[PDB]
Amino acid sequence: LYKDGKMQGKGVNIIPVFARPDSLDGTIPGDQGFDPFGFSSWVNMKFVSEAEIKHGRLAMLAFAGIMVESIGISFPGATSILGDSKDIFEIHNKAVESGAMGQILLWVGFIEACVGVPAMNEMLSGETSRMPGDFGFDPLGLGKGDKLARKQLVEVTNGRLAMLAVSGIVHHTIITGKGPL
Amino acid sequence: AMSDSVPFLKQPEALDGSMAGDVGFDPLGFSSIGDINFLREAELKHGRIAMLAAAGSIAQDIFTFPGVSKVVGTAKMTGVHDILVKQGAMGQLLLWLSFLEVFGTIALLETLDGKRAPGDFKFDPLNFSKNPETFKRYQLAEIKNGRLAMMGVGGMVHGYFITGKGPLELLGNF
Amino acid sequence: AKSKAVPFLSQPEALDGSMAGDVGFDPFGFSSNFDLKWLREAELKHGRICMLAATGCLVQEVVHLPGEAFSQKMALNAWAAAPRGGMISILVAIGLIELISNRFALTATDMFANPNRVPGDLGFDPLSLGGNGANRARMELAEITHGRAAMMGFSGMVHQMLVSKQAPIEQLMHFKAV
Amino acid sequence: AAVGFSGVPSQFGRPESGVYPAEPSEQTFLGMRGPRAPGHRENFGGKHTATMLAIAALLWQPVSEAGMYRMQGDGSLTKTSFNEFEVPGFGNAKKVPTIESLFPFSSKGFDASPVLFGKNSMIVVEDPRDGCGAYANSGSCHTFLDEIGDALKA
Ligand code: CLA
Ligand code: CLA
Ligand code: CLA
Ligand code: KC2
Ligand SMILES: CC1=C(C#C/C(C)=C/C=C/C(C)=C/C=C/C=C(C)/C=C/C=C(\C)C#CC2=C(C)C[C@@H](O)CC2(C)C)C(C)(C)C[C@H](O)C1
Ligand SMILES: CC1=C(C#C/C(C)=C/C=C/C(C)=C/C=C/C=C(C)/C=C/C=C(\C)C#CC2=C(C)C[C@@H](O)CC2(C)C)C(C)(C)C[C@H](O)C1
Numbered sequence: 001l002y003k004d005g006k007m008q009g010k011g012v013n014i015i016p017v018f019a020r021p022d023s024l025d026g027t028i029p030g031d032q033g034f035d036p037f038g039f040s041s042w043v044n045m046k047f048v049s050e051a052e053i054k055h056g057r058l059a060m061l062a063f064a065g066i067m068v069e070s071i072g073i074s075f076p077g078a079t080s081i082l083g084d085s086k087d088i089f090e091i092h093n094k095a096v097e098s099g100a101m102g103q104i105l106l107w108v109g110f111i112e113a114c115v116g117v118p119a120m121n122e123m124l125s126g127e128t129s130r131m132p133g134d135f136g137f138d139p140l141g142l143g144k145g146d147k148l149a150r151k152q153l154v155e156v157t158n159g160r161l162a163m164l165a166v167s168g169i170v171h172h173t174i175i176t177g178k179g180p181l
Numbered sequence: 182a183m184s185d186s187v188p189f190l191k192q193p194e195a196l197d198g199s200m201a202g203d204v205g206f207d208p209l210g211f212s213s214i215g216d217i218n219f220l221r222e223a224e225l226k227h228g229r230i231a232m233l234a235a236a237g238s239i240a241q242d243i244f245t246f247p248g249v250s251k252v253v254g255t256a257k258m259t260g261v262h263d264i265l266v267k268q269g270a271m272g273q274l275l276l277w278l279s280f281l282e283v284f285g286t287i288a289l290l291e292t293l294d295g296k297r298a299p300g301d302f303k304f305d306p307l308n309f310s311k312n313p314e315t316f317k318r319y320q321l322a323e324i325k326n327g328r329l330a331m332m333g334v335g336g337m338v339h340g341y342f343i344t345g346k347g348p349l350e351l352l353g354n355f
Numbered sequence: 356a357k358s359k360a361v362p363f364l365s366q367p368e369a370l371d372g373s374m375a376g377d378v379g380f381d382p383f384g385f386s387s388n389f390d391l392k393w394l395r396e397a398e399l400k401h402g403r404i405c406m407l408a409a410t411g412c413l414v415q416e417v418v419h420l421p422g423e424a425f426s427q428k429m430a431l432n433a434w435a436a437a438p439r440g441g442m443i444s445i446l447v448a449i450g451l452i453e454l455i456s457n458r459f460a461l462t463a464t465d466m467f468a469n470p471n472r473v474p475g476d477l478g479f480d481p482l483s484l485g486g487n488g489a490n491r492a493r494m495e496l497a498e499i500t501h502g503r504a505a506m507m508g509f510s511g512m513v514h515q516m517l518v519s520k521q522a523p524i525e526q527l528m529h530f531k532a533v
Numbered sequence: 534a535a536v537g538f539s540g541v542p543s544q545f546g547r548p549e550s551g552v553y554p555a556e557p558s559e560q561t562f563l564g565m566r567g568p569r570a571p572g573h574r575e576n577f578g579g580k581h582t583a584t585m586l587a588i589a590a591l592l593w594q595p596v597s598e599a600g601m602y603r604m605q606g607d608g609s610l611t612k613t614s615f616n617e618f619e620v621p622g623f624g625n626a627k628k629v630p631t632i633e634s635l636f637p638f639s640s641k642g643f644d645a646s647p648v649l650f651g652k653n654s655m656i657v658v659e660d661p662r663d664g665c666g667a668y669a670n671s672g673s674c675h676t677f678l679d680e681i682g683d684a685l686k687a
């Protein structure tokens with residue numbers, strides 16, 4: 001549920017030592033009154049909202065991949081070329097040298113350039129009334145009327161938590177030399 | 182007012198649905214820069230050349246004309262090109278395709294004027310499309326097969342660059 | 356009242372957001388002393404030359420014409436190694452392109468004498484890609500942004516070739532600190 | 534009253550022209566926008582230019598491979614220059630200017646082709662990346678990223 005005035009909206013501040021700015025409208029999902037540096041006063045809110053959502057989804061996929069590749073789950077035949085170890089950095093370097101990550105880079109960049117760049121440009125220019133992070137992708141049909149929130153808010157919160165989790169896991173792998181779990 | 186193929190993007194203004202294969206797919210707005218008649222002529226020419234090249238790669242894998250094996254030897258796909266530049270075949274091919282493409286240039290500029298549909302050379306000597314509906318069905322099939330053969334011939338020549346097998350030989354040997 | 360690019364300076368006069376790329380950035384007051392049409396024509400010309408020049412500095416390393424004289428990967432060697440009569444022909448052809456393309460109005464007193472002459476509008480549209488009205492302002496903005504980026508990039512590549520004696524891409528692959 | 538670099542001759546006391554033609558919107562493929570005579574863009578517009586470029590590209594193909602091709606006994610062809618084509622009836626000038634005089638490819642050592650890049654005049658392409666990677670290279674490949682990484686790791 002949208003819980004405007006409890007979880008989002010005007011008047012909600014989760015870290016009350018930094019007062020809620022007047023710049024935040026409360027329309028954006030995840031607006032919980034945290035802008036100490038006042039960035040919302042001068043940036044375009046739609047662009048940074050879509051950037052936060054895309055960074056969050058990338059960090060979710062990164063967390064899922066890091067945990068399944070550091071625990072030991074692998075595809076059939078995937079261990080041989082990419083090394084029978086569990087260290088994510090060496091997995092990156094081996095899969096680059098194999099050519100897998102160039103192929104991933106090519107297709108992710110093709111997806112980014114072909115529809116992502118026009119979606120961001122038309123969304124910012126005001127030609128489609130497209131919302132940030134809305135790429136119209138609902139294959140399984142799980143949000144129809146619950147899209148207002150209990151889908152958006154939980155996604156952005158898990159995105160931010162995934163960002164913090166992936167950063168923590170990477171810097172632990174740097175300092176310790178051993179992957180998580 | 183949204184694109185049918187890419188539902189989160191707007192319908193391009195140069196696209197209308199009249200041309201065969203129009204599903205509102207122009208996310209990068211190439212039709213906003215170039216003329217749609219020039220673009221459709223280019224798409225049909227690329228597609229028809231790619232259908233011919235795909236069918237040629239398949240049939241030259243399957244069999245060879247009499248006498249080509251002596252001059253060429255065991256050279257296949259793009260590897261014949263340089264050899265057949267030293268021989269006189271491709272110079273003849275370029276000469277007659279250039280002769281056809283002069284009138285192709287006149288037809289394309291006539292289309293850019295706006296008195297002729299792009300890719301309409303009125304070449305139907307067997308009169309296949311008598312009623313307009315079958316004409317529409319062949320137009321959609323032609324543009325879809327042309328795009329599919331563009332991708333296919335790209336895959337075939339780059340797979341030849343990787344393994345040097347051939348589109349049917351690579352199927353018959355991993 | 357303040358410049359948007361430089362917020363501690365007042366907005367430069369005759370700059371009102373009409374031209375493409377106008378963010379009010381003129382701290383030295385060049386537009387207060389010289390006319391904006393000549394400045395825009397000069398900016399577009401420097402930017403377009405630097406677009407072609409940056410593209411050349413990147414392309415000549417990967418792709419060469421046949422012959423010994425065109426085999427220098429570093430562009431400052433290709434300036435000297437190329438045949439001299441060809442480069443003098445290039446100079447003369449650039450002079451002719453300047454002469455006819457500006458329609459014999461070449462100076463600071465006769466270019467823009469015709470009121471229909473627009474800064475950077477030489478009438479050049481060989482494939483007529485500008486036949487669309489709402490694209491136009493974005494197109495000029497993209498052109499001037501590409502030109503500015505190309506100016507800064509080409510300056511950096513030429514002086515880094517001077518420092519390193521290396522062609523740009525292999526200088527990025529074979530980097531040696533100063 | 535007279536802005537610097539304004540470009541108006543009346544502002545500089547320069548002899549003016551008075552006559553300033555309007556700028557038409559008609560465009561030519563290989564030409565330039567500007568004032569023209571009536572009838573000009575209809576005879577020599579984009580259609581004419583493209584047709585003449587097509588005809589020139591078509592006629593380039595016999596011109597690039599210019600020569601006297603002669604069959605030998607084994608059926609092979611010997612290509613010899615038009616400069617040896619002799620004429621009976623112009624006095625002491627047996628050798629005459631030919632089509633190869635106007636297009637002297639062999640004089641410059643240029644192996645012309647019908648698409649003007651030849652076998653001995655091929656465009657030279659070479660990969661500048663030297664067969665190494667962007668980062669983590671051990672050998673003769675020290676990239677900018679490797680220099681950054683060593684600068685942090687010291
Ligand atoms: C926490 C996960 C999560 C949640 C709740 C949402 C929620 C939403 N997304 Mg989103 N998304 C996510 C992750 C998530 N997303 C990621 C990671 C990507 C990148 C691939 C995307 C890409 C994406 C696009 C491109 C679009 C959406 C859209 C939407 C909206 C409608 C669709 C919907 O209800 O999906 C919710 C459905 C699910 C979360 C399905 C459950 C899948 C399970 C959890 C997978 C589990 C796999 C594995 C077990 C993971 C754990 C590994 C670990 C054990 C090691 C809604 C706001 C659409 C929209 O309208 O945006 C406004 C849209 O166009 N999302
Ligand atoms: C600022 C422009 C500029 C200048 C001064 C040069 C200068 C040079 N180039 Mg070069 N080049 C450029 C841009 C430029 N390049 C661009 C953009 C490309 C990519 C297509 C290339 C690709 C290139 C190759 C592949 C080679 C050179 C080579 C050379 C050298 C020999 C001259 C020659 O054969 O020209 C060759 C020129 C070309 C092949 C293309 C030039 C195209 C220009 C930009 C003209 C287009 C705009 C034109 C003025 C029309 C606009 C008119 C309008 C304003 C009205 C010489 C140092 C040769 C060399 O020495 O190798 C190291 C060589 O092999 N160039
Ligand atoms: C007036 C007519 C004329 C004549 C008689 C010549 C004659 C000659 N030129 Mg020359 N040239 C001309 C016009 C002319 N040029 C013009 C208008 C330009 C443009 C500035 C050049 C640029 C030029 C260069 C840069 C070089 C010559 C060279 C030569 C000599 C050898 C050419 C050869 O055989 O290569 C035949 C080979 C080809 C035709 C292949 C060229 C490949 C294409 C055209 C590259 C694409 C470049 C691109 C179109 C440039 C666009 C810019 C342009 C629109 C401004 C020869 C003396 C070369 C020389 O001195 O070597 C000793 C040399 O380096 N010329
Ligand atoms: C047998 C005669 C003949 C031939 C073989 C021939 C060939 C080619 C080729 C071949 C590759 C090209 C590429 C080309 C191109 C252009 N020609 Mg053409 N042309 C011929 C005749 C004339 C005449 C009489 C005029 C003319 C013109 C133009 C313009 C105009 C530009 C503009 O109007 O801006 C352009 C672009 C008119 C002009 O302005 O010439 C300065 C003009 O008056 N042409 N022309
Ligand atoms: C119209 C005109 C005439 C006409 C004539 C014309 C010439 C008729 C013929 C039209 C023909 C040329 C159509 C050919 C289509 C090619 C298909 C789409 C592609 C396959 C490529 C893909 C699937 C692939 C590949 C794949 C990968 C990449 C690589 C491989 O390892 C494997 C694999 C092969 C699976 C006729 C006579 C009809 C009469 C008419 O009155 C007038
Ligand atoms: C007008 C239009 C025409 C069109 C046209 C023209 C031909 C348009 C095509 C244009 C090209 C020439 C644009 C060139 C951009 C060059 C810059 C941006 C590269 C900058 C890289 C820099 C910033 C960086 C750099 C860096 C430096 C500093 C340090 C280095 O260590 C690394 C690195 C290199 C990365 C056509 C013909 C179609 C007809 C139509 O009817 C009308």
Ligand SMILES: CC1=C(C#C/C(C)=C/C=C/C(C)=C/C=C/C=C(C)/C=C/C=C(C)/C=C/C2=C(C)CCCC2(C)C)C(C)(C)C[C@H](O)C1
Nearest residue numbers: 110114231258259260262263331332333334335336338339
């Ligand atoms: C003759 C000759 C030669 C040659 C040569 C030849 C014959 C060269 C031929 C080259 C060809 C035909 C290349 C095709 C490339 C196609 C691509 C990249 C398609 C990408 C599709 C993508 C990314 C996506 C597609 C998509 C997907 C998946 C589904 C949704 C839609 C979409 C998003 C569009 C040489 C050079 C060797 C020299 C030799 O001496 C002589």
